[PDB]
């Protein structure tokens, strides 16, 4: 029995959509993912985080081009998927590497939102994204999946490293969290 | 064949008894827990490492109400019913969060006792028990189980979350290196 | 389908031969490994990156009696015995302890040569083997092998249990990493 669900929000500014789905019938099925934010660098983190998440992810927001409310429906999809939580693993953790940079992510699966990070960032914006936005965004989807998720940067140059390792990090964890 | 001991000593002053059990039938058997040392706090303790460690414990101790004593015995009885230690992991390691709390725990289950920590508690006792204590109590465990531990507070200020964190922590590297 | 690889070089000075399996017949075959370098703590190190690494490991170097060049011969087998990556964790991480030390590895095993590393050794040589030399030794390795590797000592004081639990730490990686 696959972990679906769909989540849908419409403001006179903005709609979102997103579904998401944590599992694949080995073989069978595969992977699907597809976002699109407006944020041409927010676009490849999420995609970065379902795909080494081993999830499907269908995230689209329209309207005139904040960026938290995609996190916050992100986060909302993979809770109501994650359902019962029933027999899953519970707790992740990983390290994922880019290059320079090393990122940690340690998640406990349950009922207790909390997020601690330490995201030494180094510019203003990260590509398309802002950068102090990226520990707004990771504790958005973890308040909003009702996680206890703790986020480290151990070192890095790059800003883009960072951020692309501490997605990867925190897709490693969720993999390892959600498995059952 | 489960890995199953028990351990009973006996003084003017005291009676502890633990049996612990390693292993359970999938599906058939399950866990079961019941800890009682006169410190609630150390109950909470010990059951978290058993529960999460995935072994099912028994841990009595009796007469007029150191700790460090059950500590040993626990580790007495880890360290029987780990017995020959034959197909297993070895190495495990874990960390584990509990809200603001990160703890690691390393752990290489050969013939070597070692016990390497950082736990930077604030006050001078959690809840039922002495926290300098707790040091302690996780080297007399490693010492009698003949294992080399170490234990890490990442970060934390609660000293009742470090604490659990650490536990748990050490529960999860358990868990990973016992498996078969 | 097994992976493995064959790699021989020589100089006037030198000959190098190396055969790796990455794989072994689960109850049917096991490791075998040999190890001959000229320097007996490398020959240590080698061998116990080979056997907690689940390989298995024909590495010798005739000639009269630089180290750097066993490494990148080992790290060129590694890489072709790999072969395509597919099915592959890809990423894999551990934490090795050896009695006071305790060290890390995190490893993409992807095509982006990258070595970062944090080793403070307090002594010249170590045994066999020069201290200054490990660091490279490790990243001759990581770039022959073309995986981005990041080796950390978390403390130790020992020379000897700081090289150990790092090539302890980057075996169990490279397991987790390699397995299908
Ligand atoms: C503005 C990105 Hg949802
Ligand atoms: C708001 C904790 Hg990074
Ligand atoms: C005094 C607790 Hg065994
Ligand atoms: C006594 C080492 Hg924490
Ligand atoms: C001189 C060791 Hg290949
Ligand atoms: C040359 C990076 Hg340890
Ligand atoms: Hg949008
Ligand atoms: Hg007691
Ligand atoms: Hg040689």
Redesign the pocket.
Known sequence: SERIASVERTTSETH?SCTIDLDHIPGVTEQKINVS???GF?DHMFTALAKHGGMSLQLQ?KGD???E??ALALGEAFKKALGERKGIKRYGYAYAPLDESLSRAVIDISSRPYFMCHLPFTREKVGDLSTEMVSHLLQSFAFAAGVTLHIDSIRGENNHHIAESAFKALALAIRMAISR
């Open positions: 979102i934010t407006g944020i927010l927001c081009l904040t960026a409310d995609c």
